[PDB]
Amino acid sequence: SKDIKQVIEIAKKHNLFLKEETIQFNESGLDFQAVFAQDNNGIDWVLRLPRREDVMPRTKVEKQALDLVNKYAISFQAPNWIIYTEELIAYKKLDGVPAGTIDHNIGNYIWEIDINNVPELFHKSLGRVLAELHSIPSNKAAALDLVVHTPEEARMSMKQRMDAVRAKFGVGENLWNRWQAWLNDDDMWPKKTGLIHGDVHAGHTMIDKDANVTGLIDWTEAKVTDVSHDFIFNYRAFGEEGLEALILAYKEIGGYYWPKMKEHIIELNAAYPVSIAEFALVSGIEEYEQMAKEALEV
Numbered sequence: 001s002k003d004i005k006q007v008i009e010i011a012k013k014h015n016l017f018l019k020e021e022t023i024q025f026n027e028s029g030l031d032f033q034a035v036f037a038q039d040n041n042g043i044d045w046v047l048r049l050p051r052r053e054d055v056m057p058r059t060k061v062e063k064q065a066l067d068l069v070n071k072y073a074i075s076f077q078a079p080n081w082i083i084y085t086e087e088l089i090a091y092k093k094l095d096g097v098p099a100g101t102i103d104h105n106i107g108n109y110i111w112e113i114d115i116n117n118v119p120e121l122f123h124k125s126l127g128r129v130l131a132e133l134h135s136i137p138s139n140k141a142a143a144l145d146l147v148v149h150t151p152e153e154a155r156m157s158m159k160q161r162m163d164a165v166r167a168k169f170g171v172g173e174n175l176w177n178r179w180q181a182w183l184n185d186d187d188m189w190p191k192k193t194g195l196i197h198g199d200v201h202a203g204h205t206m207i208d209k210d211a212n213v214t215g216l217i218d219w220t221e222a223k224v225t226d227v228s229h230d231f232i233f234n235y236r237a238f239g240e241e242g243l244e245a246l247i248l249a250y251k252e253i254g255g256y257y258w259p260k261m262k263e264h265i266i267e268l269n270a271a272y273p274v275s276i277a278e279f280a281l282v283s284g285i286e287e288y289e290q291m292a293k294e295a296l297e298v
């Protein structure tokens with residue numbers, strides 16, 4: 001009840017007037033508490049209540065990415081932080097629903113689509129969305145604090161991140177030689193980079209009733225690098241068929257394509273343990289430590 005009252009008062013201080021009976025809390029994270037509420041005009045909002053100091057420095061990158069997408073992109077919605085202070089971030093909820101959500105059990109997906117009959121519009125729409133995203137001219141930005149890689153630098157980045165993980169955690173033997181083989185295969189690696197979302201998965205892909213992707217949320221991992229990261233979810237969730245469907249739609253609307261694109265994404269997928277290990281470090285959450293160690297094949 002006091003939580004509810006505080007939400008109302010913080011929102012009110014930012015001229016956001018809420019229906020108290022609609023206020024819903026997600027379980028807080030280390031960084032903020034996510035809150036849902038409807039305003040006095042019937043409009044649904046998403047609030048982030050900060051739980052750490054230095055809100056502006058820690059959100060600079062996400063906000064730069066959001067600014068780029070809101071300026072340039074028409075095929076998808078992204079959060080537009082109409083309220084952006086150290087005390088509150090809030091945006092009008094995007095249309096649609098997440099295609100799936102990570103549950104609070106094993107962590108499997110609770111799906112809004114039929115995993116055994118994925119609508120083909122999901123892949124066609126996501127391919128259009130990603131092709132638009134990855135061609136945004138991040139260079140026209142006067143200021144850019146996103147990580148920015150050339151193709152060569154994206155490869156060196158993966159090499160370094162892998163060495164780093166093999167030295168804090170160690171890395172299984174056979175997994176390493178796969179990784180190193182991938183790194184050393186010139187023809188496999190893309191010759192172009194782009195602005196990526198960096199955390200594309202069903203929980204962040206908003207869909208309409210026909211499973212068109214209409215929006216993307218949670219842009220904290222945005223950067224200019226290998227576009228391949230935004231294809232990984234499709235491969236993991238939908239296998240080779242959903243990966244191929246996404247690549248096809250992307251290529252056919254003009255997205256960057258190279259002959260070994262599928263094979264490269266599959267090798268990047270095998271490097272997924274690098275990202276879990278890194279999250280374990282930054283978050284300090286014991287569950288991700290054990291998750292990282294199993295994924296790294298100690």
Ligand SMILES: CC[C@H]1OC(=O)[C@H](C)[C@@H](O[C@H]2C[C@@](C)(OC)[C@@H](O)[C@H](C)O2)[C@H](C)[C@@H](O[C@@H]2O[C@H](C)C[C@H](N(C)C)[C@H]2O)[C@](C)(O)C[C@@H](C)CN(C)[C@H](C)[C@@H](O)[C@]1(C)O
Nearest residue numbers: 106107108109199200201229232233236237272275276279
């Ligand atoms: C397709 C099957 C599965 O789903 C996938 O694999 C997802 C695409 C996967 O994501 C894939 C693909 C990719 C590109 O992230 C979208 C990669 O970074 C991660 C490691 O794995 C998710 C989104 C990961 O969650 C991401 O973990 C990152 C380390 C941080 C990131 N965010 C917070 C910045 C977060 O979203 C996570 C670590 O798997 C979440 C964790 C709580 C529970 N998993 C262990 C479950 C059981 C999954 O295995 C799965 C449901 O069975």
Ligand SMILES: Nc1nc2c(ncn2[C@@H]2O[C@H](COP(=O)(O)OP(=O)(O)O)[C@@H](O)[C@H]2O)c(=O)[nH]1
Nearest residue numbers: 026029034046092093094096097098203217218
């Ligand atoms: N349906 C919907 N959910 C949202 C929206 N924005 C945030 N969320 C939800 O709030 C959760 C947390 O928000 P997110 O931006 O991903 O922050 P996180 O807690 O750091 O992952 C998400 O997993 C979504 O379920 C939105 O526009 N629509």
Ligand SMILES: [Ca+2]
Nearest residue numbers: 218219220221
């Ligand atoms: Ca995030």
Ligand SMILES: [Mg+2]
Nearest residue numbers: 203204217218
């Ligand atoms: Mg999220």
